[PDB]
């Protein structure tokens, strides 16, 4: 039997990405090429279940596989079996661990477009692609969730990353709905699994968590990401922020987390943020308060929250997210790791 969608967001705790991996968006290949010029082909060194037991061990719950999965596609939108037997290895290291695992698509952005004008070519295609992902996992049991998409967005426009619009807004809703339909049509466990489904760009916005659609399904989890605040968290502008900590960036952060309860408490759904952390600004004890804080404040709300983490940490660059040293399995940031840790265990 499956739980519901609302008892297995009880059970995820804080979690952890593999990023810029399985989603490492490499375009110069081809679909026939290993998995593994994939895989590597941002940076990162292969996966082994080594660095997937020092992330269960060190007390996450959850780990996040972002999976970019076009470029594996033949023209007859049929997936390289491969990469499938790939994916499902790194499935399975953390399956075997114990974990909870959410499997989604990730930079599809080239193709999936959501606008009406592109819809009638992008749907066969995202449902074709689930499908296929659906029957690999199929007999998987609970502790696997699937994720329809990651940020879909209009990419390339103005409207890229300032909530859509109303058309896109809809397309987004239309697209998780059909990738929703293919998971469920492919039977057994699919009729069950937890299904999470973004937002437009997974914005917990109002203007995009307003409009965000469930479909008539019991045991769909809504997805927003959320690398707050953004200013210490992510910027690199002349507006950074480097410091973290004051009584309203507190309360700022329980009104943003309230927020997402309730939006999508009063839609009928949990929600799961699947994405948040803070990058790089030789800031380490901000850094770590926040992370304590944000845990803490999600899970006394119910939301599990899954950090962000692409194995790069160079100092004051953009997008330094990461925590655990791949090739070596010590923590470029102990305290960090250990403040998250710490913020699942005040609640739990």
């Given at each position: 039997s499956m739980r519901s969608a609302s008892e297995i967001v009880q059970e995820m705790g804080v979690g952890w990405n593999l990023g810029n991996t399985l989603d490492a968006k490499i375009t110069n290949l081809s679909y026939n090429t290993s998995p593994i010029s994939f895989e590597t082909g941002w940076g990162n060194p292969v996966t082994?279940?080594?660095?997937?037991?020092?992330?269960?061990?060190?007390?996450?719950?959850?780990?996040?596989?972002?999976?970019?999965?076009?470029?594996?596609?033949?023209?007859?939108?049929?997936?390289?079996?491969?990469?499938?037997?790939?994916?499902?290895?790194?499935?399975?290291?953390?399956?075997?661990?114990?974990?909870?695992?959410?499997?989604n698509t990730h930079h599809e952005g080239n193709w999936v477009i959501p606008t009406y004008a592109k819809e009638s070519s992008v749907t066969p295609k995202?449902?074709?692609?689930?499908?296929?992902?659906?029957?690999?996992?199929?007999?998987?049991?609970?502790?696997?969730?699937?994720?329809?998409?990651?940020?879909?967005?209009?990419?390339?426009?103005?409207?890229?990353?300032?909530?859509?619009?109303?058309?896109?807004?809809?397309?987004?809703?239309?697209?998780?709905?059909?990738?929703?339909?293919?998971?469920?049509?492919?039977?057994?466990?699919?009729?069950?699994?937890?299904?999470?489904?973004?937002?437009?760009?997974?914005?917990?916005?109002?203007?995009?968590?307003?409009?965000?659609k469930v479909p008539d399904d019991k045991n769909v989890i809504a997805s927003v990401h959320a690398y707050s605040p953004y200013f210490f968290a992510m910027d690199t502008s002349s507006n950074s922020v480097n410091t973290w900590g004051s009584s309203y960036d507190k309360y700022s952060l329980d009104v943003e987390l309230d927020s997402y309860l309730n939006t999508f408490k009063s839609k009928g759904v949990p929600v799961v943020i699947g994405q948040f952390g803070s990058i790089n600004k030789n800031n380490t004890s901000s850094r770590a308060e926040l992370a304590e804080y944000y845990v803490t404040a999600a899970q006394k709300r119910g939301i599990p929250c899954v950090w962000w983490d692409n194995n790069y940490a160079e100092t004051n660059k953009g997008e330094t997210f990461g925590l655990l040293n791949r090739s070596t399995l010590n923590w470029y940031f102990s305290d960090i790791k250990d403040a998250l840790i710490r913020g699942y265990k005040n609640v739990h």
């Open positions: 082994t279940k080594a660095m997937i037991d020092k992330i269960k061990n060190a007390g996450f719950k959850t780990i996040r596989i972002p999976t970019t999965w076009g470029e594996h596609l033949d023209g007859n939108n049929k997936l390289n079996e491969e990469w499938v037997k790939r994916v499902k290895e790194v499935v399975d290291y953390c399956i075997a661990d114990d974990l909870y695992v959410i499997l995202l449902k074709t692609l689930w499908t296929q992902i659906s029957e690999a996992f199929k007999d998987y049991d609970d502790h696997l969730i699937f994720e329809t998409l990651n940020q879909p967005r209009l990419e390339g426009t103005p409207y890229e990353w300032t909530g859509g619009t109303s058309e896109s807004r809809d397309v987004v809703n239309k697209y998780n709905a059909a990738a929703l339909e293919s998971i469920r049509k492919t039977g057994g466990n699919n009729l069950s699994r937890a299904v999470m489904m973004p937002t437009y760009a997974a914005s917990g916005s109002s203007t995009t968590m307003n409009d965000f």
